[PDB]
Amino acid sequence: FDSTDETPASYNLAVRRAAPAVVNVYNRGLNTNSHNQLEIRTLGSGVIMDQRGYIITNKHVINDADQIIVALQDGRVFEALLVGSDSLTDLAVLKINATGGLPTIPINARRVPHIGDVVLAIGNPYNLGQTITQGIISATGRIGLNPTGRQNFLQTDASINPGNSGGALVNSLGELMGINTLSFDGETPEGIGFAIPFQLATKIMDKLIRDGRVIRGYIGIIVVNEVSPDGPAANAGIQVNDLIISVDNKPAILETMAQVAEIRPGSVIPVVTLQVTIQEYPAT
Amino acid sequence: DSTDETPASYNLAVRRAAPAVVNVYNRGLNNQLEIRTLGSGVIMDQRGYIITNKHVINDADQIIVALQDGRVFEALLVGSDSLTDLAVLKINATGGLPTIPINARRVPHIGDVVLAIGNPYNLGQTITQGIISATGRIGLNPTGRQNFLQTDASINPGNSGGALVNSLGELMGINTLSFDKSGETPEGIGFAIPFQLATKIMDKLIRDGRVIRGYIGIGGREQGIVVNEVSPDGPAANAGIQVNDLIISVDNKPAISALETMAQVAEIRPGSVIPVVVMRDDKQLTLQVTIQEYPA
Amino acid sequence: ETPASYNLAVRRAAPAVVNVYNRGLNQLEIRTLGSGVIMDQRGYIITNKHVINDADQIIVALQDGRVFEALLVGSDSLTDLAVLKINATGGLPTIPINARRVPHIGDVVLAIGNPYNLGQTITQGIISATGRIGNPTGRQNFLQTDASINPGNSGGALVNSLGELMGINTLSFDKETPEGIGFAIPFQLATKIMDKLIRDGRVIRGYIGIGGREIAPQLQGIVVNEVSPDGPAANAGIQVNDLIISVDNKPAISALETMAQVAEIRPGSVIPVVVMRDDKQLTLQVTIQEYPAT
Incomplete structure (x- = not known):
């Protein structure tokens, strides 16, 4: 057989479209217990939602930060300003002041996510560097781990780890499905993760940008x-x-x-x- | 403009098969019905015969079965087989039931994409994706010649007795066991009873109160x-x-x-x-x- | 109507992935096991060095039933690679290899190995990243993947949907329990080290x-x-x-x-x-x- 002419099945297209717009977020704090050295106390990810430099992440990623650093896949590094957060949805908005334009996550307001849809999780698990994992949408309207809370979650089996929080879940076209937020956890639960649906994320982001709060x-x-x-x-x-x-x-x-x-x-x-x-x- | 393109999906499989996968609740008296266990089950035929795992319904004082459509029934135990860990349930339904697509011609191949359908941690119906990893596996225990299908589709407590299907919604097997032994947390190793073997065991249980x-x-x-x-x-x-x-x-x-x-x-x-x-x-x-x- | 499947890649590559057993006398007991890949017809096999370290006897079992005693051609701890040699009168299956192929992040991949000695297992995922260190040596340059990997996969193949070798499954990230983070040696580096090992006995x-x-x-x-x-x-x-x-x-x-x-x-x-x-x-x-x- 000859497979040189053949073409490997791949979601590289979705990656090339979305990945440039997903960022590494670092919550830095002064170690007031020691000698005020700056240490990373929490790391996560974020999504650049528009050219102006507004970024979505989870509130829990940036809680208690003395400094918030945003790093782009192109190598640029920024101090980020906290535009606003909302603990009810665990969302937060950051702003970076890049002179040069910046990549944005593809967003299709008309797209309806369906149970069974292939998805890609994009984040910075364990600070290894941007990591892409693959799963499907496992369920919708989940409400997550915590009982009630009036929260609507996409559930996914794309492998998600500490560091993925605030990062993108996209489909095979590169369109934003949700913001990865939470992993379900004597056994260890496998392949059960939760994301804020994108429709909700965009809604909260606009409110936060406008009023500084929801x-x-x-x-x-x-x-x-x-x-x-x-x-x-x-x-x-x-x-x-x-x-x-x-x-x-x-x-x-x-x-x-x-x-x-x-x-x-x-x-x-x-x-x-x-x-x-x-x-x-x-x-x- | 991806607006006019089509996302890769297994939604078709979900629509055909998922309605037929049910939540199974094991009640035990201690005058009040209390969930002692819970798992999943698959509707095989219009009669209302359901397949689940024995360990799910062991020592149940009452067996409740819940459908995705909302209907709730009290199931009766037709029979159970210790060896294969299978059990058959009967519910008296009205207006008919959804059923799991079956193709006796289909020969499961290693590498076939598969979806697990079930109720992990009682979260609600969950779909996870993987492939067929191997066939004819003895499983965790060498004894018993289990002939399991092996899959890397994520399986958790609550998936037992639930369906494993291909991209066409066709039943490949019944999720039964997860590898949990070292320390080492094994990743992506679960076992299903192949559908062919599961059909046979069912028929023999409906015909005789045993295998x-x-x-x-x-x-x-x-x-x-x-x-x-x-x-x-x-x-x-x-x-x-x-x-x-x-x-x-x-x-x-x-x-x-x-x-x-x-x-x-x-x-x-x-x-x-x-x-x-x-x-x-x-x-x-x-x-x-x-x-x-x-x-x- | 045909089910979605990667069976083709399986039928093309899996036959060339073997079970590797490392035994020593505590008579002979299995002290480690892993997998290996048959690279060419002459019977040279690639595996990880940590799979065959300190072996008194190395057994290689193929999927078609044949079982050989392997000769250790050479090993290289800097890249954790090793080459075995088996002598087969009958033909040997070989791993499909495309030197021109450039692996891309997001490519669907299959891991083929012998986890927990259950028998040859195939798991599916994608390429998660490339050029990953670990390891400060800076001599491994891993592909990262989310195809489920467990003890026993070491030395086995990571192929794409065409059965083409992408890499040699080598490492699982262990630093809660990390999920879907495994590493493989890129085939280009595997090949370079193989030919060198075969030629000089060492790198x-x-x-x-x-x-x-x-x-x-x-x-x-x-x-x-x-x-x-x-x-x-x-x-x-x-x-x-x-x-x-x-x-x-x-x-x-x-x-x-x-x-x-x-x-x-x-x-x-x-x-x-x-x-x-x-x-x-x-x-x-x-x-x-x-x-x-x-």
């Missing part, structure tokens, strides 16, 4: 059991034991809270007819 | 097969076979390997009369033995 | 006695950090902190590229070496030695 609408309270003191809920004369069937002209069928969360603070909305003005929820 | 195999009362090692032990009052004992004599062939089939022979004896229906050539004192003798059913 | 390497590292972009070249005492470099008067700009009439652009060039130089050769000391170009003459024994 502003969520708040009600202050489907049967009611507790009404927050002096909250938008308490107002409009809402009662303990009160019952609600509709909100903002929608069926009260978790779904309600995701709906209210997007609602801008200041807007007024009828319920049961009690009239409530939505206000900003303070997470701290 | 009937041929017994010949012999314990031997590997050309010929030495007889280390001769089960007392067994088929071979009655035939007068002695310890330390070499067996050349059984039922007109040469005994090159001990594993293949013990597989052949199981197949022979109890009561069958067969030839058994042996070498004793450098002599050849063809005895006549009557097969009996393998003791409980 | 004959030139040596200058210097610990050096290229700088980031001042003249470019290799900075001398250490100077092995009584080594060729020390004798010729090279010092720590001078910059090597040329070695044997070739530009010193890359520490790795130069180190590969020094290795090719026959011991005893007297070569020009141009360095930078105090912004002055100096030309020193070193006599190459053979690389020190492990």
Whole structure:
């Protein structure tokens, strides 16, 4: 046989498209226990989401950093500014100030990820250097390890390790599917990892870039059991034991809270007819 | 503009097969039903016959079965086979059921892409991907001639009794065992019961409340097969076979390997009369033995 | 309608991957086992050195049933490679090899070996990275892969979907439990070392006695950090902190590229070496030695 003319099956195309835009993130801290030497306390990855130099990573990668270093595959190194974070989704946004343009992750807003889709994880596991691993989408809408939390996760069996956090999960076309965030863990679980779906990542990134934080609408309270003191809920004369069937002209069928969360603070909305003005929820 | 291109996917396989893979819940009283174990199962036919692993349903006071579509049933145990670790369940369903695509013509090849479908850690239905790594594996234990398919598709607690399928959604096997022994954390080594073998065991369980195999009362090692032990009052004992004599062939089939022979004896229906050539004192003798059913 | 499959690569390459057994008398007990690859018809086999170290007897078993006693042709601990030789009256399967093929990150690969002595196993993954060190020796230059690798895969093949040899599975990252991080020796390096081992019984390497590292972009070249005492470099008067700009009439652009060039130089050769000391170009003459024994 002669295989010189033949062509090896490969996802190199997806790699050439996406990899240049995935970065190594280093959380550096002053060792105040010793002699203030600068040490890496956490490392992870990030994704360059647009030419202006806005980068997505996990909040847990950059927590407690005294300094955040971003390294590109082309060799460039930057001090990164923390634009904002959001602990509810474990997302964070960084900004780098490169004069020269920079590569961006391919993003197809119309693409719907499907269970069974081939995916590639791109990150800096154990600081070995950028590493590409292959798996499939194993499941969708998972919510992750922690019970509830109102989180929607893609599950994947692409091998994921400390250092992958904040990095890209893409398909065979190089399109961003999600941000790798979490590995499931007497046995040791094999091939169970979680990513924030890209639709959600882009949504939170835009909010963080705009307000420096994620502003969520708040009600202050489907049967009611507790009404927050002096909250938008308490107002409009809402009662303990009160019952609600509709909100903002929608069926009260978790779904309600995701709906209210997007609602801008200041807007007024009828319920049961009690009239409530939505206000900003303070997470701290 | 990748916008008009098509992503590599195994979604097709998932759509065909996944609806037919179920969550199996083992309840044990202590007046309240409590999950003592959980695993997966595959709907084989429209009747509502389901395949799972025995270890999953062992000592279950009540067996609940849950479908991806939302329906929940209480299953009854048709039968279970200790050797192959298989068990069959029955649920009385209305409006019919989804079933696992089966192709008896399909010969699994090493290198074929496969998907494992199951309920790892009760997370919910999970799909993982790998290939067929080998076939005919004895598994973790040399004994038992398991004839497992080996795969590097990720298998975890909760995958037991669940389906392994190819890129066409066709059942390749039943996920059963993971390699966990050294220290060393083994990576990508799991075992499935091949679908052909799994079908046979099922039918024999639906027909009889058990699996009937041929017994010949012999314990031997590997050309010929030495007889280390001769089960007392067994088929071979009655035939007068002695310890330390070499067996050349059984039922007109040469005994090159001990594993293949013990597989052949199981197949022979109890009561069958067969030839058994042996070498004793450098002599050849063809005895006549009557097969009996393998003791409980 | 045919299932997606890499069986072709399996049917092409797997026959040429053998089970390798290292035995010693604690009579003969198996002290280690791994895999190996049949490279050419003459019966030369490649494997890792750490698989066949301190073997009283080396057994090689093929997938077609044949079993041989292997002769140890040579080994090289710097690259952890070793060559076996078996004598077969019948023809031998050989590993498919394409010298022109350039491995790319993202290429689908199969690992073929004998993990835990279960029998020949095939696992699937991709090429995760290239040019990976480890190992400060800087003499291994691994391909990284996520095809499941376990004890027993060592010495076995990493091939692409065409059955073409990509590399020799050598290492598993062990530093929680790391998942999907294994390393293989690239076939180009494997072949180079094989032919050398077969030819000389060992890998004959030139040596200058210097610990050096290229700088980031001042003249470019290799900075001398250490100077092995009584080594060729020390004798010729090279010092720590001078910059090597040329070695044997070739530009010193890359520490790795130069180190590969020094290795090719026959011991005893007297070569020009141009360095930078105090912004002055100096030309020193070193006599190459053979690389020190492990």
